[PDB]
């Protein structure tokens with residue numbers, strides 16, 4: 001295990017006949033050839049851009065690549081046709097290879113109309129190309145009618161990247177390709193499309209979830225099928241669900257907080273696809289996405305050793321731009337990684353020695369303290385490695401003027417290990433919530449986690465709305481309580497859905513749950529609208545809840561998206577009130593995403 005990481009460009013925007021290349025799919029043929037597929041985009045856009053599905057082949061394990069060839073050719077003139085968003089699926093029992101993609105004419109995903117007739121240009125069709133000669137030549141089929149059991153499903157696309165064939169269970173041999181559909185209610189849902197006859201016929205299973213999008217599946221160590229999805233509702237994380245029936249139907253969808261995502265595609269595969277059911281090796285998954293929540297950047301590989309329950313292991317492969325990626329397992333024990341660096345489509349090859357992980361997921365809880373204080377938090381390491389590590393270390397990534405150190409007891413096979421982290425925060429430090437990184441470093445590899453240190457802010461969990469002048473709840477979720485949920489994506493909104501609703505001034509008052517020394521209020525505006533922004537304000541406080549002292553602070557907030565501080569000399573108070581005197585440009589309504597209170601718990 002000498003570490004290996006290499007890359008090379010396969011398509012470069014503005015070279016070889018297209019101004020833009022995106023949307024990677026990668027597989028290994030029954031004869032060991034690597035196939036890389038992707039869009040060529042004549043007008044640089046998603047469907048219904050007149051796109052082509054392209055393919056390059058490597059016959060030497062990915063070292064060198066042959067000519068760019070056209071699998072499905074778009075038409076830029078009469079009539080306009082596009083083929084976009086490839087996904088490979090190899091039937092390893094028959095040798096047959098499929099490449100799923102859209103067939104667009106007038107409409108893409110958003111515009112597609114109900115119907116399944118291949119001649120209808122108002123439908124985004126579902127196509128599949130089939131090859132029986134290792135991807136040299138292809139025949140083409142439209143399968144929309146076959147995969148549309150509900151005439152309310154007006155639009156669909158196969159998730160680009162690579163589908164799977166089940167190896168375990170009563171449904172062994174089944175081919176599974178994930179799609180996103182839009183139903184008659186307008187929701188985006190995930191669904192598995194599958195074949196039990198080696199691609200002769202395809203059908204849709206039961207749709208799952210809401211706020212879904214491009215999504216992927218993988219067969220777990222016990223033969224359940226794990227679904228991992230882009231979140232069209234923009235949580236900043238991946239969504240997950242599990243099937244016990246070979247991908248036909250799924251349970252409840254949940255967010256996976258250990259998988260940050262900027263709302264984009266990602267890949268998940270078995271590290272050991274031939275490992276037997278129930279084995280340790282069968283539990284190992286690899287994952288690729290952009291780890292940034294704020295841009296398509298910080299492309300990262302992660303590894304789970306427990307069927308995707310935890311993700312102890314991570315390493316950055318692309319610190320810069322990284323706007324799509326797909327993983328495949330190579331015959332030589334390494335992994336291919338076909339991704340978008342911003343320059344087109346790039347092929348990378350890495351091994352597990354490069355990734356450098358140990359299967360030892362660990363936890364550190366979130367902690368609160370005051371500036372000028374120290375606190376110690378416990379560490380719990382679950383050793384899934386099966387080996388002893390006599391001298392593990394813990395390395396923390398925190399503000400450079402803080403003092404942070406930690407330690408962990410030796411790792412033992414099959415056991416939990418304990419540790420600790422002490423944090424000292426200097427006097428004066430600005431109140432806020434501070435993310436802190438932690439890396440378990442061992443001779444056998446590394447694992448990591450993160451936790452939040454809250455400094456100088458009261459506990460929102462003890463706070464409640466004492467009073468508010470107005471709130472919208474009829475047409476949207478504008479609850480006053482939204483200010484104290486720690487989420488900048490949810491907001492208090494004053495009532496707007498009745499004409500008689502009040503205009504300015506507005507007012508929101510918090511019960512802190514108890515009397516505290518306080519010295520500040522932090523305000524965060526509504527993030528996705530500019531027309532209900534607080535401008536002029538006064539802050540008042542109360543020891544007993546009806547008699548208000550103040551203004552203790554006044555001013556005019558800005559249009560900054562970040563927390564804005566209104567500070568005041570320290571005073572004891574059970575209640576704090578924000579009077580919103582005015583809106584930035586005189587609109588009627590007030591919205592606030594967050595309020596936090598600077599004080600001593």
Ligand SMILES: CC(=O)N[C@H]1[C@H]([C@H](O)[C@H](O)CO)O[C@](O)(C(=O)O)C[C@@H]1O
Pocket residue numbers: 023046047084085102108109157213214232264265
């Ligand atoms: C058929 C189609 O439109 N595919 C496009 C998808 C969807 O539009 C989407 O995920 C729907 O919400 O978006 C991309 O992944 C994207 O965000 O860059 C590009 C991809 O080509």
Ligand code: NA
Pocket residue numbers: 482483484485486487488489490491593594
């Ligand atoms: Na909020």
